[model samples]
Target chain A: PRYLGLMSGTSLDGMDIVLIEQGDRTTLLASHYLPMPAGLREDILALCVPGPDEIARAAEVEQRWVALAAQGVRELLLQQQMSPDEVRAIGSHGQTIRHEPARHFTVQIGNPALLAELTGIDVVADFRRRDVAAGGQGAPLVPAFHQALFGDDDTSRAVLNIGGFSNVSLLSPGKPVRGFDCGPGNVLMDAWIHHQRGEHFDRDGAWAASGQVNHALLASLLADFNLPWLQEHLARHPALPAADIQATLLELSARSISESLLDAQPDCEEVLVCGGGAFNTALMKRLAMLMPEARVASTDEYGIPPAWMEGMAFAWLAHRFLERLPGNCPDVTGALGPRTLGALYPAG
Target chain B: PRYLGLMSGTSLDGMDIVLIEQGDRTTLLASHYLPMPAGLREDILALCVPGPDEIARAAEVEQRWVALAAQGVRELLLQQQMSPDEVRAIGSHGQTIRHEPARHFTVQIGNPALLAELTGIDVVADFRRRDVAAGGQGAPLVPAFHQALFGDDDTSRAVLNIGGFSNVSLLSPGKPVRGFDCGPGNVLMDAWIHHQRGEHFDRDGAWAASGQVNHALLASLLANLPWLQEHLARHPALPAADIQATLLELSARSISESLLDAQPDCEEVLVCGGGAFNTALMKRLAMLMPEARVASTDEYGIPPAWMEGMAFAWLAHRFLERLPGNCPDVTGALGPRTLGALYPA
Candidate 1:
């Protein structure tokens, strides 16, 4: 039997769907990438801030997002030559709107109940709030899934996921895993390019290669956020060349990841990078330069493609939950203890 | 094992908690009523309208509300000499900030995940959304529970629960059940008093009894709101005491007339709620519908105040057994489906 996993990051970029099968080993059956419709993407971004009649407006958008998710499921099933009945369950990481951990609430709106009703497959969703309620960050929930497949007693390995917000999972041998958000991922770069050049992302880091990194801007962006910082500076920096800003944003991400890793544990032998950032040759090359002690490479060497890892992790999480196992790492999320996460929306 | 059910209505009044055990037959062990803190009640009322950072602000108040609900649970358990482990789950109706069924979304937020963690009991909450997703009204969810205990295959019984809003469950002999929200229960009268006299409720229609029912305005109010139209209506020109009396008449007429039309086969109409205590409204209901026996639910050993409390406990039992808690015929959902998401402790 196969399981469908749906993942959409905070980046508001696109959707990643994976069909996975676990038989003696977790196997990836097929993977597909689909872009979020522009109007829905705008609605999701708007929902991040509180506004007039937010829940009412949210209710309309969330149900439509569910239909979009159902479309994703159907297309992936068709691509893999599988029937709906062949799939066991769909594990959905619904779009996260607000993720203030201190507030102890993270709102993700796609309506798994509606998704289940439409797709005719059992859906497991709401993967973050429970962790927050248990006194955790309710974030970086991928460490346990990483260890499930990559755990080793021989040596320690760190898995870096660079989606919208880059996070690292330190999978040590015979010990509980440690993971946290490193810093900004592709979100800043994507938003900057979208603002300046009307492009979604800098394709293969080619645009970033053309401009020299501005030392003054790099230090300012580093001190603040490329996001929380750029929100103010973008409109003001009309004179700054677009390509130079992209290069500087790349430097900020690479700098944050390396500093956080070296300060935490420097002796790690290997670092496996997954997510959209892995495809950025300049960023990956920069990371390799910063952390010369550890071997850095894309996770394709480990059998899971970089693009499909996030979706595959959610499928693994659903398996853990259904098996009555812990899905969140206490070390990663600062939860009281590991607990089975997500609510089941049954389909019959 | 027994379950604890906590229900705080849209009235912004108090909490009704019940501890019930279901075995050979469902039995209510005990029940308790605790008034909500005045400040929190005001916060809940403020949240009813579109506001700045509502969910963010709601998160702060919701956690405190969970603590208050947990307090309600502890007090009820102590009253019964029961321990935390003795209860199976706590089914919470929570505090409804919004219930726009047409939008297919109902917001009831008290953080069941946090409630479960604090109470050391599984919490079955968000009980409305699944049914809403199923194309149901996602309200008056107590009918299925009413049928479970009060359903008689012999004589038809109409159980009317009048809280902030009034709803009826028509339990007939050999037919599918019919039920819906009939009209305003105590909401209009309560809002009127709070708006005018700065009082919470009329207190057994005492304030309403002091004035006359201005038919000129009563007819005007009746022309609109036969109870589903004009959700928010303001009568700023009418005097407070006259408006109160008219509201009492309106509630009495709404309940009695709706009951007469719904279940013509009604042998008995059992009224239960804060409205039942309103001697004047009760008197009017009895006067309006002389066809059947109209009396307080307490007459049948199910206390008028405790009926709403007990429905939530029955919901907890349904959740534990994985039974479908929603009755499609009664709820008008597209189909029968289980309703609730239990955040396990």
Candidate 2:
């Protein structure tokens, strides 16, 4: 049987949808990308923080998101010439509007009930809160999918996903799989470039490669993370060029990820990278330079495309949900034990 | 196996929890009432309308509500000397903070995931939205349960539930059962009494019975229904006594008018909910529906106050069975669909 996965990241860019044939091994059969509308992105970003009439606004956005998701599902099915019945279920990692694990709550706004109603497909969604309810971070859930897809009995490898934020999954031999958010990946660079050049992201790290890294700015950035902090320091360095800041942001991304990975698993034999950041040529070179002992390569080399990892992972999670197996790794999420994630909304 | 139902009405008064044994006949084993804290009540009412920081406030209130619901479940279990393992699942008709069928959305705030975590039992919640998603009003959900519990092959009956808002289920023989919201039930009376006397509600309709109905005020109330503040602003010189009496008349007239208009030949009208306790309102309904036998659901086997709670218990049973719980004819959905999302413990 096959399962469809729908994922919208914190970047608020678009929906990454994947259809996978699941059995002893999972194969990505088809994929589709539905870029988020600009207005919808703004509304979603507004929801990430508290605002007025949030419940009604959330409900409105949820309906719109579900409509887009249903469209993505239909488009993917149409691309593969498959019917809804051919797929077992859809695993939707809805757009995260709030994540407060300490508060024991996280809100993701894609209504699975509405999605199921529109798509005529069973949906498994709200995957994070269950882990949070089990006393876990309810995050870095992709690591379980990473271990499933990339675990090696002999090789000590780490799977690094650098989306808006970066997280690493350590797959060491004879050890329980562990993973956590490392640091900023594309988020800083994306935000800086968007603020400076009005571009959504620093494409291929071209702008960064053009300018030398500002060591002083890099020091200040590493000391204080986040967009506002960076902006605060940037306001102090009026003479510091935007390209230099971009270079520093890229270095910050690469350095934080390598440092976190090395600290977590110094003996890691290989680093399989995925997500939008894997395409950054300069970022890749810097990662390879910083971690000389480990082989750094894109996940595309190992069968899974760089951008499709999250969507594929969620599809696998849906498969786990259907099989009544644990979808979250207790070690990674710090849950009491293995717990099944996602609520099922049966198709009409 | 047994099931539990937790219902917090739009009235924002409190939660009504019922434990039921599901077999050949669903039996209510034990029940519990947990009154809403004053602070929580205000917060919930604020959410019913659009407001600032609604998401954060809602999340906070949702946690508080879930904690209260969890307590209710535990208290009921303790009262019955039962273990968590004994109950199959809980059907939580969470607190309705917003209900806008025109917008095709409704918000209910009792976190089932948190409830499942705290209670150690599976939960079926967010039951109304599915009907709304299927193009239905996502309301008056009790009709299906009413039909199941009160339908008779020979007797043409109408089940009128008077909670904050009133609705009726027309169980006419040889007809597909239908239901809809009639009008305000205890809401206006509760609000006016609270505004005038600072009491939560008029206990047993005593205050309304003490005063004579002002026909002019009754006419105005029936024309425009809402809070006492608005009525006071309109009739600055109106007596509080006459306003309460007129509000009761408006409640009875609106409900009876709906029933009479829908099924004038209705044989039996079974009343349920907190409204049944209001003797003055009951007398008014009896006077208006003279042709039909008017009585509380207590006249049948079901207790008047517990009927809504029992219906939710039945909804949970239906969910576990994968049976369709919403009546498309009643809700006007595109088609029949299973209600509620199940969160496993």
Cα deviation of A202 in candidate 1 (Å)? 5.2
Number of clashes found in candidate 1: 0
Each model's interface RMSD (Å)? 1.8, 1.2
Specify the highest-TM-score model's number. 2
lDDT of 2: 0.87
DockQ of 2: 0.50
* Runs off by more than 4 Å, candidate 1: A22-25, A81-88, A174-176, A181-259, A281-293, B152-155, B162-167, B180-264, B267-303
Instruction: Please give the lDDT score at residue B292 for candidate 2.
Output: 91
Q: Candidate 2 DockQ category?
A: medium
In candidate 1, position B277 carries an lDDT of 83
The TM-score of predicted model 2 comes to 0.82
Clashes by residue pair, model 2: none
Q: Estimate each model's TM-score.
A: 0.79, 0.82
How would the docking of model 1 be graded?
acceptable
